[PDB]
Amino acid sequence: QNITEEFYQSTCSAVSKGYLSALRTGWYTSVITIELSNIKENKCNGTDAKVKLIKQELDKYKNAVTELQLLMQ
Amino acid sequence: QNITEEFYQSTCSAVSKGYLSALRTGWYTSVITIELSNIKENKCNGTDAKVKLIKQELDKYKNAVTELQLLMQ
Amino acid sequence: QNITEEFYQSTCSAVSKGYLSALRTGWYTSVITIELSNIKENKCNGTDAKVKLIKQELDKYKNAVTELQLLMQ
Amino acid sequence: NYIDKQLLPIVNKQSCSISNIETVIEFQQKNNRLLEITREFSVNAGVTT
Amino acid sequence: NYIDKQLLPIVNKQSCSISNIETVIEFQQKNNRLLEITREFSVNAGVTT
Amino acid sequence: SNKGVDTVSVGNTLYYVNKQEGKSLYVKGEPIINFYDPLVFPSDEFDAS
């Protein structure tokens, strides 16, 4: 055990000694990039033609990306 | 560039002049509602009868909604 | 109505009387565990052999768990 | 009698799994906005910032 | 021989794809609670409020 | 000291010097079994007839 407590009745306070420190004095930046593994619509028909999973799943993304592209100014 | 800095040795302090402001003095509320595009169980059997995706996927939701209905009082 | 306001011109301050209280003086801990409903890979071939959903879906998890196992020290 | 009593029951059983699946996707997909919201309300217990 | 050597190999390849799918789904579904937890610990680095 | 004392009462308000251990909770999960059914044709009895 390193950490301890000292108690002073003179001031009726308690110190907690035995800590090593790190004082943040600046910032370090990094530019992380990432790429989209893009899907190409597969042309042909499924069980239900009224259902285009590949298309809707892209517009779900595209539209998400768009809503973020409006936050940068 | 608008923003600049002045340094006063008299007080050993530095001001950062050149900011335009917006001071929040109240709130503006809005009530947004949204509806569930509900799925109706499709009655018929699948490849594995012991697997009811649609029912469990609703109970996954239903039960989530229920857990929120318990936080309001 | 319980809550009221008193206004003092003497001090130019306003009190809000009429609140009942709860003062946190400690913590109550509980150890929650949860188990993984594990999937066993199904060995046989699908429409596209180059696609191993069950395997990739575990490695998606496995790798998340691993990345957390690196946060405890 | 094999086509009709054996292989068509399974192709149709298959035609049902694929309808359920295509739907569970389309449910997580059309209610995308709802499902996200209801998540981060679950995570902040009703008040999010 | 078309039914048995050509078309049954594909119906069975499909009955396997659909079990994989149905399982990967049923995995995101029974461990639904776990996966949230393990998500929000990743996002708060181990301590969430 | 937090060794000897776990509680300190001061009047009508109770302070807790040490955290209070609680019920342990467990959420049990059983492995999900994927099942399929291969569709096999009896060619040998047929290739004889």
Minimal Cα–Cα distance from C57 to chain F, Å?
14
Cβ <8 Å between C27 and F19: yes
- List C-alpha distances in Å: C55 to C42, C63, D38, E10: 9, 12, 30, 22
Among F residues 24-43, those touching chain B with beta carbons less than 8 Å apart: 34-37
Q: Name which of D18, F14, B9 is nearest E22 in CA terms.
A: D18
Give the technique used to solve this structure.
X-ray
Nearest chain B residue to D15, by CA: B46
CA–chain centroid gap for B26, Å, is: 21
Q: Give the DSSP letter of residue A10.
A: T
Structure-block tokens of residue B34: 């949204």
Question: Is B63 in CB contact (< 8 Å) with chain F?
Answer: no
Neighbouring chains of B at 3+ CB pairs under 8 Å are D, E, F
Q: Is A57 helix (H, G, I), strand (E, B) or coil?
A: helix
Residue C15, amino acid: V
Tokens of E22: 């149905």
Q: How far is the C-alpha of B30 from the C-alpha of B26, rounded, in Å? A: 14
CA distance C6 to C14: 6
- D-contacting residues in F 3-22 (Cβ below 8 Å): none
Strand B13-17, strand B4-8: pairing = antiparallel
Buried b (16+ CB within 10 A) or exposed e, E6-33: eebeebbbbbbbbbbbbbbbbbbbbbbe
Data resolution in angstroms: 4.1
Helix boundaries (H) for chain B = 53-69
Q: Could you say which residues from 10 to 29 on chain D have a Cβ atom under 8 Å away from some Cβ of chain E? A: 10-11, 14, 17-18, 21, 24
Interchain proximity A48–D19, CB inside 8 Å: yes
